[PDB]
């Protein structure tokens, strides 16, 4: 949980520990330090305005012996004249108060901090109105590349995107004999040595402690635009993802024979709004990322290399990321706790047949060839995005029972329950009717219907529970409860998933005790 929690192993490029590892407390430290009215160059090697995040140097030495006793040193370096203050700080032949063994770096397991398209936004104006200049001269002070014929670091202009297409968790090979810094390290040094020579300028910044960057509650208190700006880097609108032979141009000869279940309008803009960010999806690789289209070069109905041999159907359909389509749609309804309750007790293996419709689109061509310029993509799809702009339906309230008792099971111990089942039915869909996702993929008013009272044509009267689940054992799935485990497990289940009362313990809130 600690995400001022740092794991010193910096020397175990040298082969195997000796020791238990280091696990160094930024914050007891931060605290500690700026309490004595000494600043972050107590420990930091401060070049020409610049920190570096290395501890106590610039360098890293270049055998164990010497990094090891560098560390030793610069550490107990302090301890030794604080003392006076902190006669409880760890001496030296005080081996596990420095070395105690296996840690967890907090901000390892809470959420990343990023820029979001909002946040990015805020970063595009104030690098502007520092420079004193149009939002478009901004990018430069940021973004670059490597120049290997100028031998330097440039911005190139219509290049920019995640710093994590060449800054990643394990360093890529410089051009050179050296490392592109990784993530977390281009991150530390950018981001918090502007926000520091910010707040030395005095000017509005952005956070220099862990806390600051790496909680969900710091986050949260973030600061966004009402408006999130665009951020154009060329994509469509809409475009239509249709199967066939793509050269750059985004031209793609297209056999209709070859085509089915059919093409796919795909809202790209509203994407950018729903997801928040561009590279969720245009994720980095082991090599490197971009804002490609995803099916140039990379994913295709046969499989490349170029993307790992994930198909054109798999990089729109796997499951268990958030890559694909499908992925983090399903990803989605099962973290929501305004959804989890009806798709967590899903199955998770299986693409539902039913599902294939809401993406692909009827009413093409059946044969023939047919080439299909980039534009022309966009044209249709964009028409047929706004043609379905549809209002979505439920079930009248008439239709839909309103209070139900329920008494299907002597040697008995509680009443008939009792389920607020309209009120049910209307939480769940006001609910998903915030979600253009769930709108959208649900399709029929009686689909929801089914979270419940699944496995059985949709109906307005569906069958009941005992109907399939009083069934004698021996006829029933492995899965399939009897009376008593299907409430229990569906109705229980969607409370422990939603956050809901009555809670599993509460058994009196459904059902009140007998009188025997
Ligand atoms: C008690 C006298 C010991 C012993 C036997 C060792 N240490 Fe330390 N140690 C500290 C830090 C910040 C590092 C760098 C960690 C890393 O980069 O991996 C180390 C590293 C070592 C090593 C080399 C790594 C290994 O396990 O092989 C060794 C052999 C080692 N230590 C032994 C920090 C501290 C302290 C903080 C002030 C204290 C006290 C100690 N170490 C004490 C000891
Ligand atoms: C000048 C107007 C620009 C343009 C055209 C872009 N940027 Fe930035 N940018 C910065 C950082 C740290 C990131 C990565 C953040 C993260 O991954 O969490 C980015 C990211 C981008 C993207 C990709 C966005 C995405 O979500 O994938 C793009 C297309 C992009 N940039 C273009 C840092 C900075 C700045 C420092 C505060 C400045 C100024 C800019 N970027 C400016 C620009
Ligand atoms: C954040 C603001 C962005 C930006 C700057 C881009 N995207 Fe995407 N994008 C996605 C898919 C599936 C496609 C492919 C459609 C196809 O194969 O043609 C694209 C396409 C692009 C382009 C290229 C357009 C071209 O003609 O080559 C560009 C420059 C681009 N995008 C930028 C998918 C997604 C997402 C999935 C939910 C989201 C989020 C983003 N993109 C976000 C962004
Ligand atoms: C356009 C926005 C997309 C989409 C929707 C996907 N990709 Fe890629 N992909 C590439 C490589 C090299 C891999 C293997 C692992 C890696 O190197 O990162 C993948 C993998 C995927 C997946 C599977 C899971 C995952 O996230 O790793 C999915 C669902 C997926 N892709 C979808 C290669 C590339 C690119 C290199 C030229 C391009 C561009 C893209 N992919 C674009 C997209
Ligand atoms: C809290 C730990 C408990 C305990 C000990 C029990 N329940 Fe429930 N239960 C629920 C529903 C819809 C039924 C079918 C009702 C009926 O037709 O009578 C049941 C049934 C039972 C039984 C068998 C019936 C009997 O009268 O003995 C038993 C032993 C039982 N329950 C124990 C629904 C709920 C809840 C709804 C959200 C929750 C909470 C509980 N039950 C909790 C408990
Ligand atoms: C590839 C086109 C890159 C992108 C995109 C980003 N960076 Fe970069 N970065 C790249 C190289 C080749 C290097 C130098 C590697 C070396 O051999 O030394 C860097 C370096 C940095 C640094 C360190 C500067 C130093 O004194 O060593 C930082 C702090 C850094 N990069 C940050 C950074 C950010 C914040 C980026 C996105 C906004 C970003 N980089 C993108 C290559 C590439
Ligand atoms: C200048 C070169 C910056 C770099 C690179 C990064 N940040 Fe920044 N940050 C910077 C400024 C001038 C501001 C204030 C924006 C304004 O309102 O004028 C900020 C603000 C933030 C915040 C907001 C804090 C809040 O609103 O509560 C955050 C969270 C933030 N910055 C984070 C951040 C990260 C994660 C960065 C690298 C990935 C990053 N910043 C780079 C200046 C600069
Ligand atoms: C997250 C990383 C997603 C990926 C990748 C894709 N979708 Fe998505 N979609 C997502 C959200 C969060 C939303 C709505 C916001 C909400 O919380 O509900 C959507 C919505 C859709 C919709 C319905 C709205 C519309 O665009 O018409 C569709 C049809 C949809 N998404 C399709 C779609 C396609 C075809 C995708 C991959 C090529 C795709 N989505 C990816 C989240 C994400
Ligand atoms: C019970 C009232 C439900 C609630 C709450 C939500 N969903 Fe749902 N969803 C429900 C059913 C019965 C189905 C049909 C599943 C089937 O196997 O046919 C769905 C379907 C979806 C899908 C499509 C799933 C897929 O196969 O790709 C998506 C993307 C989806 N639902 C999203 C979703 C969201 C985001 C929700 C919270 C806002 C949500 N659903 C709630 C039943 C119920
Ligand atoms: C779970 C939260 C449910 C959803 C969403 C819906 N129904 Fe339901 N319903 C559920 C249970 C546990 C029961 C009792 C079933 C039994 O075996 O006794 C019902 C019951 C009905 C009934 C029967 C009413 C009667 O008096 O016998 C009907 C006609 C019915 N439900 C319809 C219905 C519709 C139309 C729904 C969506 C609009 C719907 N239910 C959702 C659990 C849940
Ligand atoms: C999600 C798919 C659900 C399933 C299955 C069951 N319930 Fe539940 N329940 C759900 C929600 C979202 C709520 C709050 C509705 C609201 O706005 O109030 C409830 C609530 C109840 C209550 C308390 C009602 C109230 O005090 O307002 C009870 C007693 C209850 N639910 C019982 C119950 C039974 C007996 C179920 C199986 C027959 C059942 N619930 C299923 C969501 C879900
Ligand atoms: C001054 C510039 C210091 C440097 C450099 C290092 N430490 Fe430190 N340390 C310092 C103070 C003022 C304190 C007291 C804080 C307190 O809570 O009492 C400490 C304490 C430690 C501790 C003990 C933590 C505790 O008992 O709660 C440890 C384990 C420790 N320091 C380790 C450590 C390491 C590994 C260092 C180099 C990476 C290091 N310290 C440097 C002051 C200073
Ligand atoms: O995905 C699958 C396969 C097996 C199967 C079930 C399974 C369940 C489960 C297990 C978890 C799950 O959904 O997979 C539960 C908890 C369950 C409960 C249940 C309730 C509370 C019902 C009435 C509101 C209900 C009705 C029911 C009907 C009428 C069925 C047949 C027409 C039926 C079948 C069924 C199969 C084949 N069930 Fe169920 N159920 N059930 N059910 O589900
Ligand atoms: C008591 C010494 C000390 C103080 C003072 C100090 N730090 Fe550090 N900091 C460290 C150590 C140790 C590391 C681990 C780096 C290493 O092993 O070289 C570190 C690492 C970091 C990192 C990177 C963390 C990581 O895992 O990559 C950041 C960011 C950072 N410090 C910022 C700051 C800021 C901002 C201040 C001013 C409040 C500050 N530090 C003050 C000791 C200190
Ligand atoms: C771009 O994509 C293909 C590269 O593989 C080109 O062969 C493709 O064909 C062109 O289509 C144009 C449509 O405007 C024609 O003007 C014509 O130049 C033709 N080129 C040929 C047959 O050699 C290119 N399309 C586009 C839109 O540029
Ligand atoms: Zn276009
Ligand atoms: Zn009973
Ligand atoms: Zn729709």
Not at 3 to 26: N, R, S
Not at 110 to 137: I, M, W
Not at 164 to 179: A, F, M, T
Not at 219 to 245: C, I, N, S
């Amino acid at each position: 949980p600690k995400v001022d929690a740092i794991v010193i192993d910096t020397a175990a490029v040298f082969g195997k520990l000796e020791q238990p590892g280091v696990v160094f407390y930024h914050e007891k430290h931060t605290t500690a330090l700026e309490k004595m009215a000494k600043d972050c160059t107590s420990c930091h090697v401060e070049t020409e305005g610049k920190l570096s995040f290395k501890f106590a140097r610039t360098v890293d030495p270049t055998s164990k012996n010497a990094m090891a006793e560098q560390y030793h040193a610069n550490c107990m370096a302090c301890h030794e004249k604080v003392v006076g203050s902190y006669p409880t700080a760890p001496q030296a032949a005080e081996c596990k108060r420095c070395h105690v063994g296996p840690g967890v770096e907090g901000a390892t397991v809470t959420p990343k901090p990023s820029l979001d398209l909002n946040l990015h936004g805020r970063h595009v104006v104030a690098e502007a109105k520092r420079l004193q200049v149009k939002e478009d001269e901004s990018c430069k002070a940021c973004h670059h590349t490597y120049d290997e014929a100028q031998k330097k670091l440039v911005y190139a202009k219509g290049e920019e995107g995640s710093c994590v297409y060449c800054h990643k968790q394990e360093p890529l090979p410089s051009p050179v004999d050296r490392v592109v810094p990784s993530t977390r390290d281009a991150s530390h040094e950018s981001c918090v040595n502007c926000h520091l020579s910010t707040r030395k300028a005095q000017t509005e910044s952005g956070p220099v402690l862990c806390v600051g960057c790496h909680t969900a509650e710091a986050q949260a208190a973030w600061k966004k635009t009402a408006e999130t700006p665009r951020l154009f880097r060329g994509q469509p609108d809409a475009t239509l993802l249709v199967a066939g032979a793509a050269t750059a141009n985004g031209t793609v000869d297209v056999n209709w024979a070859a085509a089915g279940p059919g093409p796919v309008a795909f809202d790209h803009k509203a994407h950018e709004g729903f997801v928040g960010n561009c590279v969720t999806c245009h994720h980095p690789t082991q090599t490197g990322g971009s804002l490609a289209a995803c099916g140039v070069a990379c994913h295709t109905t046969t499989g490349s290399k170029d993307g790992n041999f994930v198909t054109t159907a798999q990089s729109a359909h796997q499951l268990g990321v958030t890559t694909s389509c499908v992925g983090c749609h399903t990803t989605q309804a099962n973290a929501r706790k305004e959804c989890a309750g009806c798709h967590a007790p899903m199955q998770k293996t299986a693409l539902s047949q039913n599902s294939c419709i809401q993406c692909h689109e009827a009413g093409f061509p059946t044969s023939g060839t047919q080439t299909l310029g980039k534009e022309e993509r966009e044209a249709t799809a964009a028409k047929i995005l706004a043609a379905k702009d549809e209002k979505p339906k439920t079930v009248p309230l008439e239709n839909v029972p309103e209070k139900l008792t329920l008494n299907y099971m002597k040697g008995d111990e509680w009443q008939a329950a009792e389920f607020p089942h309209r009120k049910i039915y209307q939480k769940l869909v006001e609910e998903a009717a915030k979600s253009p996702m769930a709108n959208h993929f649900h399709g029929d008013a009686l689909t929801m219907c089914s979270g419940c009272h699944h496995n059985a044509k949709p109906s307005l009267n569906p069958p009941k529970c005992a109907s399939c689940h009083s069934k004698p054992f021996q006829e029933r799935t492995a899965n399939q409860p009897g009376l008593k485990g299907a409430f229990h497990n569906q109705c229980i289940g969607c409370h422990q998933e939603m956050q809901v009362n009555p809670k599993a313990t509460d058994c009196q809130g459904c059902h009140k005790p007998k009188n025997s």
